[PDB]
């Protein structure tokens, strides 16, 4: 299994946060590209990033290791693979 | 909580599959945009789509309701929100 987190908010702030996490390459297993919810009226201003962890221990540390502004939503969970 | 699925494979086939699911608007809660894994040498040929369900019942039916070719990986799990 592999636990993952979801960061939703402004892509402008997310892009700047990813650059700061580059030095912390040992704080995650891998990072996906940027995606956003879709429906009608062409909605692509929002941006989200999928993050995966190698173990529940790495996810717990990442929670108290990386700082997140109030314009981002942090969600955690576990997926069966 | 909300269970979600991950479909990874060729974006060309995924785009055609999404069009066929348009008629089944009552088979999912919402659909995210397309994203792919990133690392080095510019990797963006792959494409994935995040799907969310309103209940474990909708996810189970979607498993035996939509057809998936062998070029796509199907993964299921539950996230705590």
Curated annotation (Swiss-Prot), chains A, B:
Compartments, as annotated in UniProt: Host nucleus
Gene Ontology cellular-component terms listed: host cell nucleus; host cytoskeleton
Post-translational modification: Phosphorylated.
GO biological process: DNA replication; DNA-templated transcription; regulation of DNA replication; viral DNA genome replication
Alphabetical UniProt keywords: Activator, DNA replication, DNA-binding, Early protein, Host nucleus, Isopeptide bond, Phosphoprotein, Repressor, Transcription, Transcription regulation, Ubl conjugation
Alphabetized GO MF terms: DNA binding; DNA-binding transcription factor activity; nucleotide binding
Keyword Transcription belongs to the record: yes
Covalent link Glycyl lysine isopeptide (Lys-Gly) (interchain with G-Cter in SUMO), residues: 8
Consequence of changing residue 8 to R: Complete loss of sumoylation
Region (DNA-binding domain): 2-81
Main location: host cell
Family: Belongs to the papillomaviridae E2 protein family.
General remark: HPV16, in comparison to HPV types 6 and 11, is more often associated with malignant genital cancers in humans. Part of the antigens expressed and presented within HPV-positive head and neck tumors.
Its biological purpose: Plays a role in the initiation of viral DNA replication. A dimer of E2 interacts with a dimer of E1 in order to improve specificity of E1 DNA binding activity. Once the complex recognizes and binds DNA at specific sites, the E2 dimer is removed from DNA. E2 also regulates viral transcription through binding to the E2RE response element (5'-ACCNNNNNNGGT-3') present in multiple copies in the regulatory regions of the viral genome. Activates or represses transcription depending on E2RE's position with regards to proximal promoter elements including the TATA-box.
Oligomeric form and interacting partners: Binds DNA as homodimer. Interacts with protein E1; this interaction greatly increases E1 DNA-binding activity. Interacts with protein L1; this interaction enhances E2-dependent replication and transcription activation. Interacts with protein L2; this interaction inhibits E2 transcriptional activity but not DNA replication function E2. Interacts with protein E7; this interaction inhibits E7 oncogenic activity. Interacts with host TAF1; this interaction modulates E2-dependent transcriptional regulation. Interacts with host BRD4; this interaction mediates E2 transcriptional activation function.
Name the UniProt record assigns to this protein: Regulatory protein E2
């Amino acid at each position: 299994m592999t636990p993952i987190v979801h960061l939703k908010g402004d892509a402008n702030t997310l892009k700047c946060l990813r650059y700061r996490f580059k030095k912390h390459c040992t704080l995650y297993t891998a990072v996906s590209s940027t995606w956003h919810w879709t429906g009608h009226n062409v909605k692509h201003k929002s941006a989200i990033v999928t993050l995966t962890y190698d173990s529940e221990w790495q996810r717990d540390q990442f929670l108290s290791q990386v700082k997140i502004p109030k314009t981002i939503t942090v969600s955690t969970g576990f997926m069966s693979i």
